[PDB]
Amino acid sequence: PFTADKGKCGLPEIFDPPEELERKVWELARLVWQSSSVVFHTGAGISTASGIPDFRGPHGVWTMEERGLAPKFDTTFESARPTQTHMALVQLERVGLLRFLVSQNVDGLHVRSGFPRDKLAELHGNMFVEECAKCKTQYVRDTVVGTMGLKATGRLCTVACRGELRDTILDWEDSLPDRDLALADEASRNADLSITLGTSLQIRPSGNLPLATKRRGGRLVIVNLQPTKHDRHADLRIHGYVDEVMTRLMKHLGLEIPAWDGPRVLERALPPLPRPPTPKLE
Numbered sequence: 277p278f279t280a281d282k283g284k285c286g287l288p289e290i291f292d293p294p295e296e297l298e299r300k301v302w303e304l305a306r307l308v309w310q311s312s313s314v315v316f317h318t319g320a321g322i323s324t325a326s327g328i329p330d331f332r333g334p335h336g337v338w339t340m341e342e343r344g345l346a347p348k349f350d351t352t353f354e355s356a357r358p359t360q361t362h363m364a365l366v367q368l369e370r371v372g373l374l375r376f377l378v379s380q381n382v383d384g385l386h387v388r389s390g391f392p393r394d395k396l397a398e399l400h401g402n403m404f405v406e407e408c409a410k411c412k413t414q415y416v417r418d419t420v421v422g423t424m425g426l427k428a429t430g431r432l433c434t435v436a437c438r439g440e441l442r443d444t445i446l447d448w449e450d451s452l453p454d455r456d457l458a459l460a461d462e463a464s465r466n467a468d469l470s471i472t473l474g475t476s477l478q479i480r481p482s483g484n485l486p487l488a489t490k491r492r493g494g495r496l497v498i499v500n501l502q503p504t505k506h507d508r509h510a511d512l513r514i515h516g517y518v519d520e521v522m523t524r525l526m527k528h529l530g531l532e533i534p535a536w537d538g539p540r541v542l543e544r545a546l547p548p549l550p551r552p553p554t555p556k557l558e
């Protein structure tokens with residue numbers, strides 16, 4: 277807990293020059309167009325532009341702790357808005373270009389963006405989500421569940437049960453939820469494209485899921501400001517702000533980034549919306 281390996285912290289940031297960055301996002305667009313099953317893996321870097329600091333970045337939680345300083349939050353979790361990145365991911369699922377979303381993030385922003393829960397694995401849990409120990413019924417709350425570590429919240433199951441409700445926030449020693457990891461693992465293995473956004477890929481087995489896509493000829497894209505455990509295994513690495521990358525990419529795909537009507541929970545993905553015809557590639 278206190279001695280817990282926090283991994284490589286505060287590594288230098290890489291910025292692709294604008295010309296190289298434009299070319300790689302066009303190449304990313306080519307890969308999304310060519311791919312039959314695209315899986316997205318997200319981590320703390322997709323939430324930094326909403327004022328929620330990451331863990332291993334220059335001003336990350338663990339980086340700042342290492343130097344006797346504190347992380348700085350520019351929002352509460354409750355007042356945090358989905359980024360352009362979050363909202364681009366909502367649209368990519370709606371138009372059938374996203375098969376599955378795997379996230380290490382406990383910040384609740386995918387759920388709140390209105391991203392469908394049945395196409396999302398929340399590997400490390402969700403601040404806003406409590407679960408009944410007896411019937412496993414989950415509750416998505418409008419405020420953060422006050423505890424961490426799979427502890428009693430003080431609330432009780434209301435299923436037509438009075439089961440003890442507990443947080444979904446893994447402590448260091450806790451293994452990943454078997455449902456989410458199993459779905460994340462199946463998505464990643466079956467994927468022919470795995471795109472990583474704002475994760476250093478340092479956590480096992482979360483960070484290892486995208487590598488599973490490489491088995492059977494799959495392509496791995498890594499979007500991150502810093503180096504990542506698995507840079508070597510990437511078909512493509514894009515060093516830039518995940519919002520610049522995703523807004524440029526949406527523009528190439530001919531997709532708008534949808535409006536956020538405030539916190540909304542969608543349990544089941546809706547029928548797929550129309551999308552632009554694919555460019556001629558080869």
Ligand SMILES: Nc1ncnc2c1ncn2[C@@H]1O[C@H](COP(=O)(O)OP(=O)(O)OC[C@H]2O[C@H](O)[C@H](O)[C@@H]2O)[C@@H](O)[C@H]1O
Binds near residue numbers: 501
């Ligand atoms: N706007 C941005 N655009 C692009 N990259 C960014 C941006 N902001 C930050 N980054 C990058 O975003 C990356 C985020 O790296 P890490 O901080 O390790 O977050 P994780 O989600 O992988 O952390 C995994 C778990 O570890 C913890 O213990 C918790 O349990 C976490 O759930 C960095 O490399 C930045 O360079």
Ligand SMILES: Oc1ccc(/C=C\c2cc(O)cc(O)c2)cc1
Binds near residue numbers: 328347382445446
């Ligand atoms: O696994 C975890 C469990 C709990 C927390 C707590 C707060 C926190 C801090 C951040 O800078 C980002 C984030 O999304 C959450 C963080 C990680």
Ligand SMILES: [Cl-]
Binds near residue numbers: 337347
């Ligand atoms: Cl903190």
Ligand SMILES: [Cl-]
Binds near residue numbers: 547548
């Ligand atoms: Cl829809």
Ligand SMILES: [Cl-]
Binds near residue numbers: 424425445446447
């Ligand atoms: Cl904790």
Ligand SMILES: [Cl-]
Binds near residue numbers: 528
């Ligand atoms: Cl198009």
Ligand SMILES: [Zn+2]
Binds near residue numbers: 412438
């Ligand atoms: Zn119950």
